Design a protein around this ligand. Structure first.
Ligand SMILES: O=C(O)c1cc(-c2ccc(CNC(=S)c3ccc(-c4ccc(C(=O)O)o4)cc3)cc2)n(-c2ccc(Cl)c(Cl)c2)n1
Length: 122
């Protein structure tokens, strides 16, 4: 209730602008999809929301793949990010790798996209 109050509004901008990595923000998963990988473990890319912004530049550490494959981490769930790393590509784009996270509320217990977040412009 006041659902957006459940999310760390402003965390996406803090990660991408300030380079803040000590925060443990609470974010909503909007979408998850596999990337094209070949002969190596699958890799998942996530569209995440902090209630104000969405950002599609997240990938999951492969050690967390079971959370996706066993359906605990899925679209609409709310999770707390306990550890993440930022990397920057040759072309300037930043990628956030999610290393440790906790699902606070399952997709089924939330059920909808929270608020009206808008895409973050890098
Ligand atoms: O096949 C595809 O569709 C497809 C493909 C990619 C795409 C794929 C790869 C890279 C480069 N590899 C980077 S950044 C990377 C990957 C893993 C790690 C890492 C550290 C620790 C761990 C772990 O434990 O698993 O993993 C650190 C850096 C860029 C892009 N993308 C893609 C393009 C743009 C963005 Cl912003 C994002 Cl997040 C993904 N789409």
């Amino acid at each position: 209730s006041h659902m957006v109050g459940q999310l760390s509004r402003g965390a996406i901008a803090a990660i991408m602008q300030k380079g803040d990595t000590n925060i443990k923000p609470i974010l909503q998963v909007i979408n998850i999809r596999p990337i094209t990988t070949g002969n190596s473990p699958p890799r998942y890319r996530l569209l995440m929301s902090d209630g104000l912004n969405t950002l599609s530049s997240f990938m999951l550490a492969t050690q967390l793949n079971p959370l996706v494959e066993e359906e605990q981490l899925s679209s609409n769930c709310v999770c707390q990010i306990h550890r993440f790393i930022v990397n920057t590509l040759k072309d300037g784009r930043r990628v956030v790798i999610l290393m440790e996270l906790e699902v606070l509320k399952s997709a089924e217990a939330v059920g909808v996209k929270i608020g009206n977040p808008v895409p973050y412009n890098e």
